[PDB]
């Protein structure tokens, strides 16, 4: 009785969700009819689907998902894919016409017409929940329904719900590679509405996933099947303390107590330590202490910021598999003795560990192998300050020559939100500068 609704927005939200709901169905016995297989099961006695499923009178199950898009084509494939019989036919909310890479269109003109339909449907899964914990926004930063339409959920989901712990998983635009040229306008104007309105906000750039695939594994040339399979592992490992029993149960509430110093500092990083190829997995031991010092590396941190620049603020660990609660307290002995990994002065303890029993599965055709031990390490670094200083220098080259603005003015958006949002993230960027200064 610990429900946890996941709501996905946009083309990044759908295609992460396809990899996400591949894995959730495969952990339990949900085949794409939704009926668990009949093996003349006398007992049954499994109530591990209840976080992400609801049991009907028949053998079916329905997920909690609210797939939302303004673009009808990518939501049309999940309508006629092999998961056609799984999702309830109304939960695949589509739009009527696309947003097309405009924050103004995504938030003012074409994103406002759909939203009166979805927010009824979140109630139809809210009332079914009994002890609902918090949501999971899956969204992007490039396009209109990822940047602007998600800006309009957060201004109305906060006042309608309040004390539910919302979490998100963005895809930050890279410092060097890019798909769109208009995206630094979107990525500043989306912070001002998600600084106040997202409780905890995980954030992963698509460069280190683009880098760790070509380097740790023996594979080259991946697509978004191989990126979103990796992100779909992280979302399962965070929530898995709600699904399967272990030694220390870190639910969704206790992360944000142990990871956020100040309410304006809630942007941690994320990693995944035993990512390895199945040709490569049986060569090396993957011990308890081999998956932590090979997790504090600067080469396997999923955002393009180097943590040898800033100093660590808070760290959280989520082990998974066959892990004794002893050797996680001797791996810390190797980390804290080093001089490379600096913690901030006012945080002596600086850790939060968690153990869970059930080892990860593999999807058939999946790049990462099966293991016995696995850990996801969420840390809060000061060195995330440079992932914005690389961005706003690509925003002044926009705005001081005043290019690409004539699209944004006539939609229903005035110019005053540009210079307000630039100084607003400049208020946030100064706040990281002061907490890293040592107090004597």
């Amino acid at each position: 009785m610990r429900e946890c609704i996941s709501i996905h927005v946009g083309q990044a939200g759908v295609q992460i969700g396809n990899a996400c709901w591949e894995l959730y169905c495969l952990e339990h016995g949900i085949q794409p009819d939704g009926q668990m297989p009949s093996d003349k099961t006398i007992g049954g006695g499994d109530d591990s689907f209840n976080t992400f499923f609801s049991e009907t009178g028949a053998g079916k199950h329905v997920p909690r998902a609210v797939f939302v898009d303004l673009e009808p084509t990518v939501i049309d494939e999940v309508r006629t894919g092999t998961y056609r019989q799984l999702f309830h036919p109304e939960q695949l909310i589509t739009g009527k016409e696309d947003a097309a890479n405009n924050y103004a269109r995504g938030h003012y003109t074409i994103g406002k017409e759909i939203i009166d339909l979805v927010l009824d449907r979140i109630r139809k899964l809210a009332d079914q929940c009994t002890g609902l914990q918090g949501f999971l926004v899956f969204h992007s930063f490039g396009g209109g329904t990822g940047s602007g339409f998600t800006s309009l959920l957060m201004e109305r989901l906060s006042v309608d719900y309040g004390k539910k712990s919302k979490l998100e998983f963005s895809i930050y635009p890279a410092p060097q590679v890019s798909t769109a040229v208009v995206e630094p306008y979107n990525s500043i104007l989306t912070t001002h509405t998600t600084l106040e309105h997202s409780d905890c906000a995980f954030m992963v750039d698509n460069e280190a996933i683009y880098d760790i695939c070509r380097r740790n594994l023996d594979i080259e040339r991946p697509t978004y099947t191989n990126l979103n399979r990796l992100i779909g592992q992280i979302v399962s490992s965070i929530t898995a303390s709600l699904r399967f029993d272990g030694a220390l149960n870190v639910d969704l509430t206790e992360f944000q107590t142990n990871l956020v110093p100040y309410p304006r500092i809630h942007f941690p990083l994320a990693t995944y330590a035993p990512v390895i190829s199945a040709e490569k997995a049986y060569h090396e031991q993957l011990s308890v202490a081999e998956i932590t010092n090979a997790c504090f590396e600067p080469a396997n941190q999923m955002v393009k910021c180097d943590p040898r620049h800033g100093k660590y603020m808070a760290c959280c660990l989520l082990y998974r598999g066959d892990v004794v609660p002893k050797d996680v307290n001797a791996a810390i002995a190797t980390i804290k003795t080093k001089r490379t990994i600096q913690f901030v002065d006012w945080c002596p303890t600086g850790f939060k560990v968690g153990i869970n029993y059930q080892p990860p599965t593999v999807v058939p055709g999946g790049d990462l192998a099966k293991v016995q031990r696995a850990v996801c390490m969420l840390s809060n670094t000061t060195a995330i300050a440079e992932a914005w200083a690389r961005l706003d220098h690509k925003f002044d080259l926009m705005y001081a020559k005043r290019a690409f603005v004539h699209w944004y003015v006539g939609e229903g958006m005035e110019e005053g939100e540009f210079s307000e949002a630039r100084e607003d993230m400049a208020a946030l960027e100064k706040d990281y500068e002061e907490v890293g200064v040592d107090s004597v």
Binding site: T73, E97, Q176, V177, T179, A180, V181, Y224, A403
Partner: protein, 427 residues
């Protein structure tokens, strides 16, 4: 469910459209009489985007055809695919224009424009949720340039927020094929720079350069040249026609690549082009496409972009390909050539992939590049226009039947500012 209304203009417009509906049909798999007989249903699940349905599965293309000379309007009714357009939509003219633009705009242009508007609003009422409009014309003639400029001027009364593309045929820099062409061409652009949200530029001799050099076809007629450009105008409107991994329709291509609303003059090209000699020889991987689209030689508007700088470029990738491969191979065009890319935009390229390729190929791609090379084009006509205005050459064919001489000088100021607009954004 969201769809595009095709509409043509002129003898060049009609002859393009007869080979545009010739190449969209059996990629959807349609017989010469209008019954779907293709293999897989994936092409059937959104066939309504360019097609319309009737009794017993008899499909009707929804294109609106207008031309003033009925002697070449019947040439496409006698073609192989002439029996699929419904003959209510043929709007013939009883007399020709005479290649003066204002005849196509004032005297014998305004006579038919009540009828051409009658069939589109009858059609657009029958549309479900319309998205855009599609136009083909040449600038060089009063049948094509004059008629289209009167249509697009007062279609913005009724359909303002509908995303309009026009696929012009800009006159060639070496030989323009009409004597009194540049009066028509300079007067056309003033109705183009304020109305049309996008416009393309197909030099007629740059397609001749392709059959000169790349394909090296022996005997290319206009059936061959119309087929080379009709594939390009199929690649743009494709991500709403098939599913993809990172899709991009017409609105996402527009708001992501023009920086300023009177700076929208484009420059297209189509990537996989191979002669019969080199086709046994040629590599086929993803960086082999970056050779083709970013070759200035394979560019179907005349001016080489070494004389200017790009602002934003587009690259839609029809095929089943690795996403990283595209993304890795797009910075490596920016790095070794960073002198042809401006500095107040961080990244220039626009990425789009669609899974279903053109019928048979592995991969294919289309490039649309907004350049400052085109000021070297637009500087040419403005000099070419002044040589016939100051000495009043061929004046009386336009003055005595239409507007006075101010409209020429106003069209100079609408033209001279744009060339100064490109240059100010060049550095």
């Amino acid at each position: 469910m969201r769809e595009i209304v095709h509409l043509q203009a002129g003898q060049c417009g009609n002859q393009i459209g007869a080979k545009f509906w010739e190449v969209i049909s059996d990629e959807h798999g349609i017989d010469p009489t209008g019954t779907y007989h293709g293999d897989s249903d994936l092409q059937l699940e959104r066939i309504n985007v360019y097609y319309n349905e009737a009794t017993g599965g008899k499909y009707v293309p929804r294109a609106v055809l207008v031309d003033l000379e009925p002697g070449t309007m019947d040439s496409v009714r006698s073609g192989p695919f002439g029996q699929i357009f419904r003959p209510d939509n043929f709007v013939f003219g009883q007399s020709g224009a005479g290649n003066n633009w204002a005849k196509g705009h004032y005297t014998e242009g305004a006579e038919l424009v009540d009828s051409v508007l009658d069939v589109v609003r009858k059609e657009a009422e029958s549309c479900d949720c319309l998205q855009g409009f599609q136009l083909t014309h040449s600038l060089g003639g009063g049948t094509g340039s004059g008629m289209g400029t009167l249509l697009i001027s007062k279609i913005r009364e009724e359909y303002p927020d509908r995303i309009m593309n026009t696929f012009s045929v800009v006159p060639s820099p070496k030989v323009s094929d009409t004597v009194v062409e540049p009066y028509n061409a300079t007067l056309s652009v003033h109705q183009l720079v304020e109305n049309t949200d996008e416009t393309y530029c197909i030099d007629n001799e740059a397609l001749y350069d392709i059959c000169f050099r790349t394909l090296k076809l022996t005997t290319p007629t206009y059936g061959d040249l119309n087929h080379l450009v009709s594939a390009t105008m199929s690649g743009v409107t494709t991500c709403l026609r098939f599913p993809g991994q990172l899709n991009a329709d017409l609105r996402k291509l527009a708001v992501n690549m023009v920086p300023f609303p009177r700076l929208h003059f484009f420059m297209p090209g189509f990537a996989p082009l191979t002669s019969r000699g080199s086709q046994q020889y040629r590599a086929l991987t993803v960086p082999e496409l970056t050779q083709q689209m970013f070759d200035a030689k394979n560019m179907m508007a005349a001016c080489d972009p070494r004389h200017g700088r790009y602002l934003t470029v587009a690259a839609v990738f029809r095929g089943r390909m690795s996403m990283k491969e595209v993304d890795e191979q797009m910075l490596n065009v920016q790095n070794k050539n960073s002198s042809y890319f401006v500095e107040w935009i961080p990244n220039n390229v626009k990425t789009a992939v669609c899974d279903i390729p053109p019928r048979g190929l592995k991969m294919s791609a289309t490039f649309i590049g907004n350049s400052t090379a085109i000021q070297e084009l637009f500087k040419r006509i403005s000099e070419q226009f002044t040589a016939m205005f100051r000495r009043k050459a061929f004046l009386h064919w336009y003055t005595g039947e239409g507007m006075d001489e101010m409209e020429f000088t106003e069209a100079e100021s609408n033209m001279n500012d744009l060339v100064s607009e490109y240059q100010q954004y060049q550095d």
